[PDB]
Amino acid sequence: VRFRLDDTDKQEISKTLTSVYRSLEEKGYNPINQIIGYVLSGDPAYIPRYNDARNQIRKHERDEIIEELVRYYLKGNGIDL
Amino acid sequence: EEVRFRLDDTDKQEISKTLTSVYRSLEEKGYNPINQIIGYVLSGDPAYIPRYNDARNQIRKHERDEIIEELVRYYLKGNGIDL
């Protein structure tokens, strides 16, 4: 199963952040605080290695995550994007 | 169905009003609105926002980390990740 990952297209940001949030909770962290820390810093060290959470965040770029956060916020607050 | 109210200036500036107003001002003046907002969010520099239509004045009512905190909290709540 070493050669299984035959689709390296990025998955949905919502799927990544769901798994990262759950892993943060299991390890006893405040998940919202650690996710804010990653977005402020761009540093994956804010995310634990448990259950591949840090490797999952590394599949994305921070500026890509910020763009989705901004688009989601504006749409939910009344902007027709 | 929710109406936005124009409050007094002594009321705290709400981030939802700032960011939507900044977007509409950037768009009306011909900038790329998402791109300039990302520039602000990455840098903390109000100069990515034009002074036009009080856009820069509104972004200066907040700190970069306050805007990022609200963006994250709004996303996690809206997508059902936090509850």
Residue numbers in the entry:
A (entry chain A): 8 to 88
B (entry chain B): 6 to 88
Recite the paper's sentences:
Here, we identify a protein (CcpS) that is phosphorylated by Stk1 and modulates the activity of phosphatase CpsB in Streptococcus suis, thus linking Stk1 to CPS synthesis. The crystal structure of CcpS shows an intrinsically disordered region at its N-terminus, including two threonine residues that are phosphorylated by Stk1. The activity of phosphatase CpsB is inhibited when bound to non-phosphorylated CcpS. Thus, CcpS modulates the activity of phosphatase CpsB thereby altering CpsD phosphorylation, which in turn modulates the expression of the Wzx-Wzy pathway and thus CPS production.
Although the electron density map of the N-terminus was not clear, the partially folded structure of the N-terminus between CcpS and CcpS-T4ET7E chain A crystal structure was obviously different (chain A, N-ter). Notably, the ligand CcpS-T4ET7EN has a lower affinity to CpsB than ligand CcpSN. As expected, rCcpS-T4VT7V has a higher affinity to rCpsB and much more than rCcpS-T4ET7E at least tenfold. This result further supported that CcpS phosphorylation indeed modulated the affinity to CpsB. However, rCcpS-P or phospho-mimetic rCcpS-T4ET7E has no significant effect on the process of de-phosphorylation of rCpsD-P catalyzed by rCpsB. The most likely reason for this is that the glutamic acid substitution can not fully mimicked phosphorylation at Thr4 and Thr7 in vivo. Instead, CcpS-T4ET7E possessed properties of both the phosphorylated and non-phosphorylated forms in vivo.
